[PDB]
Design a protein around this ligand. Structure first.
Ligand SMILES: Nc1nc2c(ncn2[C@@H]2O[C@H](COP(=O)(O)OP(=O)(O)NP(=O)(O)O)[C@@H](O)[C@H]2O)c(=O)[nH]1
Ligand SMILES: Nc1nc2c(ncn2[C@@H]2O[C@H](COP(=O)(O)OP(=O)(O)NP(=O)(O)O)[C@@H](O)[C@H]2O)c(=O)[nH]1
Ligand SMILES: Nc1nc2c(ncn2[C@@H]2O[C@H](COP(=O)(O)OP(=O)(O)NP(=O)(O)O)[C@@H](O)[C@H]2O)c(=O)[nH]1
Ligand SMILES: Nc1nc2c(ncn2[C@@H]2O[C@H](COP(=O)(O)OP(=O)(O)O)[C@@H](O)[C@H]2O)c(=O)[nH]1
Ligand SMILES: Nc1nc2c(ncn2[C@@H]2O[C@H](COP(=O)(O)OP(=O)(O)O)[C@@H](O)[C@H]2O)c(=O)[nH]1
Ligand SMILES: [Mg+2]
Ligand SMILES: [Mg+2]
Ligand SMILES: [Mg+2]
Lengths: 290, 336, 284, 285, 290, 290
């Protein structure tokens, strides 16, 4: 793999990507926080191939957390093999053994929708181990279900963790401040006002006037969302993905195409963000169309 | 028997709890005002999302969920009927904080004297929270939440909920409720006022430093070093600045609302606070008497025993911003 | 496309959105034929009236990820990993990529949708379908064995707008789902033509639309408490007239006390007078 | 059977119009209304053959679960076996006889969580989705060889009671699939008076008693919140004890006042003894 | 091993370190409460070598409580064997037997993130026995899953226990006051004020003005944190671990490095800390940058 | 076994211990209810040897309750063998069996921290037998796990049951119904204003004036605790055992020693108690120092 191969279609600036790779080599644990629809899932699989420098998926593991995920599933736990129960090496446990075999090559574990699952319960033993300065055999720990003190588990240095956490829900947030320290938090913006996003549109036989008008529209709206931080922070603001996909057929991005999507997706979204104000709903909806 | 317009009272409560347009509501009485905040206040939370706290649950299920407890399984022989004693984390909104809201709303609906529209909206929300369990509320329930894990916003409505519960009395019917005549009692109204200023001054008087100061009597007794018999003396507020220190003692009296003799019995406390308090800096020592009046504000100065003392008033019922203007003007003059 | 009481435009809108977006939510009050729409619609997209391809379920609060996808559950001998329906269903379509296999989810709002779907909440997206996007499941014994949505799969969600829950609002799921509202359709001639094709009176059918709309507008009048989402559906009128009993005002009298009145009670709670008024207004 | 039932014939006719079409029904009323006795006579009425075998009855409680109702794993002498529940066993009996209507009685349904018990099946019992078309494999049905469908012949009756003020609003699940019917106590009805005049009751004693109960049942329903229409007293107490062989009399009534209504009245109000004592004495004279 | 080697790199004052041993040797069970990043995990491994007087891991044991630890896991529990269950001695029971193998040499057991688990549930019988007075054969007690033949477990006198409860998560705090009497709580400060912290930076190519600039701002900020107690209490104040690490490569500490820290980790932490007005974020962020 | 050896060291008044001995001979089922640090566990071992009149371990048995404790372990239950399930007589069952041989000699069972586990789950059926009147073979019952109705178990009258419960938690506001009927609560005072507590210090080279100044403060402090009812009742008040410990070396009492105890135990407890009011912590914490 190579860097520019990824960057061709990527809307985020390279500086952030450079900032990301700068921290990740250091911290080895990161969290990318932004609203849905900005390519968190998109970049993350690409980024692994950059950091290793090789397009090897065997060294990459990708999972999505949720409420029904626990330490028994993740790391280790007793589960039924059949008539007889056995201790089951969890997914992260298995991944780490692979990384030990090849210390040189970087091994990456990708966690989507991290904020849902009860992280303190899930990581547990890992919550201490994953820190960049505490990795290695010197800080080896016996596990909960380890047979004896001698059976111990240590995170290797090569491991890099990538976490994806949406900013839409205040209910589900990483309030665990101790855990917040382990992860280096990288905000991501919708990136409407970028040339690379516009170049993709113009590449898809798009009107330059319509493009710049569109970017201005959302940029103003996004700032309006960011304004009322008491009710809705900048984390709620609309992503670029609604507009991205759907042109694969070859349909030119006319106003009609935009008028359709707004009715189907953005219109109720505005209703929920602004439950009390109907005028504000009509105001912003009509503003995009006119 | 004149009292404050009810809308103004809500502002001082806000400062008391340390965290708007009320022109919209037409019900002057307090509970109409207070419910509209809560009823709308919950709606603000739901938009962002209510708190979901993982409650671990250990229960008997027909399969593996989370962590199996081997002991209770074998002891109860649940393997035989295909069941396990397993620990897992259901995600609920059934926490103590959120349960209080719904249970509080029940009393809110049950209140006999209330705007119908407010009761209409509240009954909607009461239905909209099916999973949460009704409760018979006590102060101990609020007590358990003094840890305050919850957000800054949640603590606001709960503080509202505390006011309602304590100030709720059953009325004509056994089930229904009737609101307390809060304004009529001076002690709680005064205790509001004493607390109102302390938190208020921290906000606006960033220039000065605001502290409640405990004092020890200058006395010595051969009998006891403790002086437990002596009254405990703790200032209402002290507002110290480098150029001048200043103590305020403020209380609500019914007599003062009548514009005659004057009720300033609290003043007797004040001198002894000035006396036992000794400043190392020796910049200055000042005192203030401030009370609430309805019609007008009058300011006086005194030089009594080497102490600089002021009596002043505020015309509550005027307007909250102009009232806010007046207070900043007041403290500025005397502080100087 | 013949007996449907909904406009042809909306279904034409739906068909394009479904083919492109691959996931949709049909939200409206109960009794508008959301089930029959999707069930009709599923047969259109397949091109054949094939029910084996189509699967429908009705979520409920206790429904869980253990049931849906994967789970550890007992056989006669003991416990085993039991592939839930959706894994079994996607595997079935995985055998036959060409045909379009459909999964319908009713009363979606009730359950904690994130919990149930879990892993597939990412995988379900139209672009992220294939082995490249495969992931090992929570209970998967080995990381190498993974689950991926095939391209043929299309998912349709039927949502009741009558129980708003101020517990969990997810705007990320809304990103996956393209939301489509459905109106009752009293005004539509196609609903009216059915009754006139059942020997109804021209005034009686026309009078009904006047009656319900006045009620419906009142329901959508107060946006704060209620909305168009609460307003009454039509399907109650569809059933019960295929016996051979043609419409009459006496027939209307049965349904109102029978069916509509509890709905009114729910909506117009602790307001008997308004129930009495609007109920009786329909009788007039 | 018609004359033996005390409620209006109009309601009895109405139900059959409802149940036959809707196929799912729930009766909500005060305790002591003969809900159980009503349903059986109504169940036998629909079939026309007065067969108890066709009818099966269940009483719900919070512990009641899917394993009891439908299917579950029970211990064998060694190991465990799949064990068919009532409803799974019940319908397959009815599957053989399509023409024959088979009835299921679920008492005190509101106490339990309908979802937990039914599980998958809660959609299949909605009348529109019945028969082979709506087949589903069950949770514990390891193979896909056989699927479970509730046939059209099945009718499901639910006995609910509005007695308790502790009860909150009914679960949303019920409202969709069930048609709610409220039953009056039926004191005013002639059929109840003809059951007491048949026992040589004085018409004055009858009319006074009908007048006596009506005033209380009106008063208990006068309360808006705590005591509704659902609270008001039923007639079942009057049945048992007259046709056994003992004639009606004021003392016989007086015994009944002490027996149930006097303690029952206390629980409903639970505040004022004089209010109870006034009404308790008022019943006596 | 000696104090000079241990306290060579530690940023903690000597004052607490001896005070720690003052409380420990008499009481034998202690808890260190401080915000994350003050070396709680860091010192605890080192302290064990002082008391034994040697750099030995054998007499030391380290574990972390992950809200799924149980009495079956810590002390005595049942584990499946191939087809049927067996009783397995937990880790502490296994640890104590070695500790009483030789009473002379002291044994240390360290529990990180101890606050999380429901300690009354986990310890069970031990909650009384851990105390210094109630040790030895005199207070021998039979366990739950002990054999019917009387076999009793007593906390040996040589054993020392150390607990590590972070002060951020309020909910996860000891409210079992009966248990809090067994332990002695040692507050640990952020560690900014110390010159030993300052000496570390100057030794790593740092300006004293920039160094003294840094220390000045944090302590003011911690006062702003400490000023409130409603939401952000005294304990929330920021640790020094962030600044410690990432400089091994040779990057000198400067506003560029400081700027990366501020935007990347701390500033996200701050907006979650306040989450009422951004201006409070904008103020304190800019203050650090200036 | 002379009382003088037993009772001299004890701080509790001779009135309360004798009253305790009354109900214990009378009812034989007793609960000692007081906050930690007042010697509840301390006295209870002494009372057994007092009543028996001898130092004999066999006649006295001790346990601490916790959530995992159950009927199957306490009384009777099945423990797995390699495959098979074998019944095992539990402690209390085995304990009475020993007591049955010697009905004349008093036998004692000590249950610490009883409230933590619900008695019903453990005792269950035996709560019928446990009560003082319904004891002896007359009330004999066959157990749940008895193979046949023939074998029966009765609590002989000789056994006395002692229960130690701490009033430090909010959950205990709803005291368990099972305990109140069958057990008789007795309150253990903190016992600062006592001669023997004072005399303990005076013997250990303590200034008399220093002692009395301290007791007035603690008695004053506990008065503040008890006055509240919502958060902290009278039962929450401090015990007398923080100060007892740490003087075994002979180090003289002073304000210096007091400060270590205050800062390491009582102040953070007060932070836990008085979370809402930092100044109240400052008010009392500094008050002791003076
Ligand atoms: N072609 C293209 N698509 C992009 C780009 N950035 C984001 N997207 C698209 O946006 C969609 C979602 O990507 P994703 O990472 O899942 O967004 P997200 O923020 O993680 N969503 P969520 O948080 O809800 O999981 C995909 O269609 C993805 O390809 C981009 O730079 N180029
Ligand atoms: N060199 C050196 N590093 C220190 C010192 N104090 C803390 N650190 C460093 O700060 C980082 C974290 O320390 P740590 O013990 O884990 O803090 P913690 O309180 O245990 N972390 P947490 O609360 O999150 O569990 C490590 O790099 C640690 O070495 C110190 O005095 N000297
Ligand atoms: N010398 C002496 N020590 C006492 C006296 N009372 C209590 N202590 C000491 O206080 C310490 C703990 O007593 P203890 O009974 O365990 O208190 P507790 O109620 O059991 N504690 P908890 O409630 O937490 O379980 C022991 O050192 C005990 O000897 C006393 O009167 N004299
Ligand atoms: N012909 C026709 N029948 C309809 C229409 N809508 C609903 N129905 C019928 O109404 C009955 C009940 O529909 P149902 O799915 O239960 O209502 P819903 O789930 O609340 O939308 C079925 O016979 C439907 O096919 C319609 O638009 N046209
Ligand atoms: N003969 C006859 N008995 C009735 C009638 N209605 C109720 N009963 C009797 O009342 C009793 C059943 O009452 P019920 O309310 O169901 O008891 P509950 O279920 O505990 O509330 C039986 O004795 C019934 O036979 C009736 O109409 N005719
Ligand atoms: Mg995504
Ligand atoms: Mg640490
Ligand atoms: Mg004890």
């Amino acid at each position: 793999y190579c860097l520019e191969d990824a960057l061709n279609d990527l809307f985020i600036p390279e500086t952030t990507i450079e900032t990301i790779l700068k921290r990740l080599t250091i911290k080895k644990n990161i969290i990318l926080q932004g609203p849905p629809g900005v390519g968190k899932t998109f970049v993350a699989r690409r980024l692994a191939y950059l950091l290793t420098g090789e397009k090897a998926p065997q060294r990459v593991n990708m999972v999505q957390f949720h409420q029904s995920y626990s330490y028994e599933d993740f790391i280790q736990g007793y589960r039924p093999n059949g008539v007889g129960f056995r201790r089951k090496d969890g997914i992260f446990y298995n991944f780490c053994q692979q990384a030990k075999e090849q210390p040189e090559k970087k091994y990456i574990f990708i966690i989507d929708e991290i904020n849902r699952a009860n992280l303190s319960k899930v990581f547990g033993e890992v919550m201490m181990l994953m820190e960049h300065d505490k990795r290695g055999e010197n800080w080896s720990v016996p596990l909960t279900y380890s047979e004896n003190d001698e059976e111990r588990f240590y995170v290797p240095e090569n491991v890099y963790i990538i976490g994806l956490m949406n900013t839409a829900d205040r209910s589900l947030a990483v309030v665990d401040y101790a855990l917040r320290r382990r992860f280096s938090f990288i905000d991501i913006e919708p990136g409407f006002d970028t040339p690379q996003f516009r170049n993709f549109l113009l590449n898809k036989k798009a009107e330059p006037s319509f493009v710049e008008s569109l970017c201005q529209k959302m940029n103003e709206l996004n700032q309006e969302i960011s304004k009322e931080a008491t009710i809705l922070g900048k984390g709620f603001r609309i992503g670029h993905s609604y507009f991205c996909c759907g042109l694969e057929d070859g349909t030119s991005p006319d106003t009609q195409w935009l008028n359709e999507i707004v009715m189907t997706d953005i219109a109720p979204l505005l209703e929920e963000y602004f439950f009390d104000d109907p005028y504000k709903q009509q105001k912003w909806t009509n503003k995009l169309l006119g | 028997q004149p009292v404050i317009p009810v809308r103004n009272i809500y502002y001082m409560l806000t400062y008391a709890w340390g965290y708007a347009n009320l022109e919209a509501i037409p019900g002057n009485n307090l509970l109409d005002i207070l419910g509209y905040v809560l009823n709308k206040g919950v709606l603000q939370l739901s938009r962002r999302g209510l708190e979901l706290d993982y409650n671990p649950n250990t229960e008997i299920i027909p399969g593996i969920k989370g962590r199996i407890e081997f002991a209770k399984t074998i002891r109860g022989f649940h393997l035989n009927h295909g069941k396990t004693v397993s620990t897992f984390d259901m995600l609920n909104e059934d926490t103590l904080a959120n349960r209080i809201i719904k249970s509080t709303l029940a009393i809110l609906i049950k209140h006999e004297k209330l705007n119908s529209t407010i009761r209409d909206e509240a009954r909607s929300l009461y239905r909209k929270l099916p999973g949460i369990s009704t409760l018979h509320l006590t102060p101990q329930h609020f007590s358990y939440l003094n840890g305050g894990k919850n957000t800054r916003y949640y603590k606001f409505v709960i503080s509202v909920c505390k006011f309602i519960v304590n100030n709720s009395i059953p009325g004509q019917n056994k089930g229904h409720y009737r609101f307390y005549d809060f304004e009529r009692n001076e002690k709680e109204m005064s205790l509001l006022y004493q607390k109102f200023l302390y938190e208020f001054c921290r906000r606006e008087l960033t220039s000065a430093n605001t502290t409640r100061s405990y004092l020890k009597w200058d006395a010595s007794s051969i009998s006891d070093q403790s002086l437990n018999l002596l009254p405990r003396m703790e200032t209402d507020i002290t507002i110290r600045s480098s150029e001048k220190i200043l103590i305020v003692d403020a209380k609500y009296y019914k007599s003062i609302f009548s514009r005659e003799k004057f009720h300033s019995q609290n003043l007797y406390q004040l001198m002894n606070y000035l006396w036992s308090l000794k400043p190392e800096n020796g910049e200055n020592i000042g005192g203030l008497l401030i009370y609430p009046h309805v019609d007008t504000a009058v300011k006086h100065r005194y030089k009594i025993n080497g102490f600089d003392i002021g009596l002043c008033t505020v015309n509550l019922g005027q307007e909250w911003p102009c009232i806010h203007q007046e207070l900043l003007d007041i403290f500025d003059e005397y502080l100087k």
